[PDB]
Write a protein that binds this ligand. Structure first.
Ligand SMILES: C#C[C@@H]1N[C@@H](C)[C@@H](O)[C@H]1O
Length: 438
């Protein structure tokens, strides 16, 4: 045991109702909206292939010139109520919103900088409009916050002098102020998801990360805080020097997911994954033909994968400069929505089932020990292999949509062949099992 003052706080998984809710939600959407939406990946006639929200970096644009985009910020098609309806129709139980990205432009009228929605032609408090609209639909709201801030010159990448230390100490107070502001202006917030905490300046200031966590939990009862915020005394991030998880949930699976056979360790803690529709674009990019774009079933597969291993999944959207969503994103949300409406009993409020992974797809476990087989790969054998843990038998199988009974044949001790449905469902589908222990 190494002694640590700013290491892990939590024991195991939080089991208060607020965390249970965060967990049971399972499916979320991510919104990346900021000034980067205006150029849409293009600067000075040149289209850059990197992530559009990092365009300031790719095109080497100075802060003053970048933040001048505020003068064109006028999303006349924006309508918080439509956005919330879209999220509702997709089947998302929560939404995570970029309050401020690396660029430093704030979607709420912060008192602590001039780079906010207030100083734009649009003027209005976008974030407040969204919080109300989503909450009205019964959708929880979570706040993305970039610690790294390219708009504030007291920011430092590292601490190489007392001068740097002085500047950065001012920067951390500025940050605390924005955070307190967010927590008190918008007290229904359920989570803060920190990003841009990877620089050596932050790694050297673990105490501040632990402080930010404590500060926000005092202000917002039951609020959740991601692991990404946190560094310990030694600069170890996410998990501390004694290997204990910091924050309330693990938050490293970004555009990738744990292996279903090798990474079972993740079922021991809460966690949340996020993903993009193209290969790597979070903010709006005008040309999606530049990388592979996932199909709905590919996205659905990742959602169920996450849940099968006891984690949440958040699918990202990068709204247009005008405040509307591109056609591809509307189609995606609608498709995910249709499927969740039919099969979401195997997703919402479900968890790791403790069964050995099989090739046809994923198991999930319901709140009353339902075991759901979510089938993505249809075997030509017409038989779906189910190997049970010790002491578990399978008493019945049922097609979720129709209620029809599905033949279960015992092949060996602890193994069965569950038949495919008489009629091929033509899409990833669910069979529900009734199981019994000894
Ligand atoms: C890097 C990086 C950032 N982290 C992802 C969640 C996006 O915000 C991306 O731009």
């Amino acid at each position: 045991e190494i002694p640590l003052k700013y290491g892990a706080t939590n024991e195991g998984k939080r089991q208060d109702p607020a965390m249970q809710k965060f967990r049971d939600n399972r499916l979320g959407a991510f919104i990346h909206w900021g000034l980067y939406a205006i150029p849409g990946g293009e600067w000075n006639g040149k289209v850059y292939g990197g992530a559009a929200e990092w365009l300031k970096s790719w095109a080497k644009v100075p802060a003053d010139e970048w933040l001048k985009l505020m003068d064109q910020w006028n999303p006349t098609k924006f309508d918080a109520k439509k956005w919330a309806k879209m999220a509702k129709e997709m089947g998302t139980k929560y939404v995570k919103i970029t309050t401020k990205h690396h660029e430093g432009f704030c979607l709420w009228p912060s008192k602590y900088t001039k780079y906010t929605v207030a100083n734009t032609p649009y003027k209005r408090d976008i974030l407040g409009e969204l919080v109300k609209a989503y909450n009205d639909e019964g959708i929880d709201v979570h706040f993305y916050f970039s610690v790294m801030d390219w708009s504030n010159p007291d920011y430092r990448y590292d601490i190489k002098s007392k001068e740097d230390s002085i500047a950065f100490s001012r920067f951390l107070e500025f940050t605390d102020n924005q955070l307190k502001e967010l927590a008190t202006r918008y007290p229904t917030v359920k989570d803060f998801w920190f990003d841009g905490t990877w620089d050596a300046s932050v790694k050297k200031n673990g105490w501040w990360t632990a402080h930010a966590e404590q500060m926000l939990k005092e202000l917002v009862p039951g609020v959740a805080i991601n692991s990404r915020l946190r560094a310990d005394d030694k600069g170890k991030r996410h998990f501390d020097s004694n290997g204990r998880l910091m924050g309330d949930y693990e938050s490293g699976y970004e555009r990738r997911l744990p292996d279903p056979v090798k990474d079972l360790k993740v079922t021991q803690w809460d966690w949340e994954a996020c993903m993009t529709i193209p290969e790597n674009q979070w903010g709006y990019h005008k040309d999606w033909s530049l990388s592979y774009v996932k199909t709905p079933i590919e996205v659905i597969d990742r959602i169920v994968h996450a849940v099968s291993m006891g984690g949440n999944m958040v699918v990202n959207f990068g709204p247009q400069a005008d405040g509307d969503f591109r056609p591809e994103e509307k189609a995606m949300a609608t498709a995910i929505g249709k499927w969740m409406n039919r099969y979401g009993k195997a997703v919402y409020a479900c968890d790791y089932a403790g069964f050995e992974k099989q090739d046809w797809g994923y198991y999930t476990r319901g709140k009353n020990d339902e075991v759901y087989m979510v089938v993505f790969n249809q075997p030509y054998s017409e038989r779906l292999i189910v190997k049970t843990p010790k002491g578990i038998t399978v008493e019945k199988a049922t097609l979720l949509t129709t209620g029809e009974d599905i033949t279960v044949v015992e092949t060996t001790r602890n193994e069965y062949n569950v038949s495919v449905p008489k009629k091929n469902p033509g899409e990833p589908y669910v069979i529900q099992l009734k199981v019994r222990a000894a």
